[PDB]
Design an enzyme around this catalytic site. Structure first.
Site, short mmCIF file in Angstrom:
data_model
loop_
_atom_site.label_atom_id
_atom_site.label_comp_id
_atom_site.label_asym_id
_atom_site.label_seq_id
_atom_site.Cartn_x
_atom_site.Cartn_y
_atom_site.Cartn_z
N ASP A 271 41.93 24.54 39.48
CA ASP A 271 42.42 23.14 39.48
C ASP A 271 42.01 22.35 40.75
O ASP A 271 42.51 21.25 40.93
CB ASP A 271 43.94 23.20 39.27
CG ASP A 271 44.67 23.77 40.47
OD1 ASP A 271 44.03 24.41 41.33
OD2 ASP A 271 45.91 23.63 40.55
N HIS B 88 34.86 28.89 42.92
CA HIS B 88 36.24 29.32 42.53
C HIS B 88 36.61 30.61 43.32
O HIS B 88 35.72 31.46 43.41
CB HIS B 88 36.31 29.43 41.02
CG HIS B 88 37.61 29.89 40.48
ND1 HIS B 88 37.75 31.00 39.69
CD2 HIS B 88 38.84 29.36 40.57
CE1 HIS B 88 39.01 31.14 39.32
NE2 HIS B 88 39.71 30.18 39.88
N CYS C 7 42.64 26.22 44.32
CA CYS C 7 42.60 27.69 44.22
C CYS C 7 42.54 28.37 45.58
O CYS C 7 43.07 29.50 45.79
CB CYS C 7 41.52 28.18 43.26
SG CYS C 7 39.83 28.11 43.89
#
Ligand SMILES: *CC(=O)NCC#Cc1ccccc1
Length: 223
Positions: free
Chosen positions: A43, A217, A46
């Site tokens: 989102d 990520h 992270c």
């Protein structure tokens, strides 16, 4: 478990990149050094959410380490004040972080810590606190941090640190690591035919926390 998942076997992430020879090679290699992984929601928050959960998890049952960490956290409002943040604007976010530190001391369980980091309200208050402390730590040492970087330090913190959902780079990682004395290691898995490789923050340290960076990520690793 929509923000921080259950633990899974490291090879469970092969399925995220099927028939990709380089990803397969690097995950197989990673599995020789790490046993398990937890996933985070992608989102834009992270890094902060992963670092907070994993570091506090690593403290469970360690009474002198928890005492020293709590002593540092109690001083963090002074960092925020010295950078120009006002107490009535940061109080709700500081109190949420101090509350989860007390949960590590008094309850002491994985299951209770996971519940707080999967509660959208508590968990997002915790992430916002960590973003304000990152900003404050950079602003108070602008002459030191100039070199990672918005031309202005001030503009960079306003646009790329303080707002929810803004992604990190080496400057934010280094600053939050230094602000909370958290030693962490980042493993890098990109799509190029290169060595699997890592960085330690800071360089000489024994890490508490291990993260996997892939597809912009961060997921949590277990050695
Ligand atoms: C740190 C963060 O929130 N990054 C955004 C993302 C993502 C992502 C990438 C691959 C699979 C799922 C989510």
């Amino acid at each position: 478990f929509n923000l921080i998942s259950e633990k899974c076997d490291i090879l469970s992430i092969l399925r995220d990149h099927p028939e990709n020879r380089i990803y397969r090679r690097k995950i197989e290699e990673l599995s020789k050094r790490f046993t398990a992984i937890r996933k985070t929601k992608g989102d834009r928050n992270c890094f902060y959410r992963a670092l907070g959960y994993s570091y506090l998890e690593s403290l469970l049952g360690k009474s002198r380490e928890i005492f020293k960490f709590k002593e540092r956290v109690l001083q963090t409002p002074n960092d925020l004040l010295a950078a120009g943040f006002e107490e009535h604007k940061f109080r709700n976010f500081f109190n949420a972080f101090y509350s989860v530190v007390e949960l590590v001391e008094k309850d002491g369980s994985v299951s209770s810590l996971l519940k707080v980091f999967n509660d959208q309200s508590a968990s997002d208050h915790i992430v916002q606190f960590l973003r304000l402390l990152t900003s404050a730590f950079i602003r108070n040492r602008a002459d030191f941090f100039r070199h990672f970087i918005e031309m202005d330090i001030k503009d960079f913190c306003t646009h790329e640190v303080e707002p929810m959902a803004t992604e990190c780079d080496h400057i934010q990682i280094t600053a939050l690591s230094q602000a909370l004395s958290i030693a962490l290691q980042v493993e890098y898995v990109d799509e190029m035919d290169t060595a699997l490789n890592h960085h330690v923050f800071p360089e000489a340290a024994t890490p508490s926390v291990y993260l996997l960076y892939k597809t912009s990520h961060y997921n949590i690793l277990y050695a």
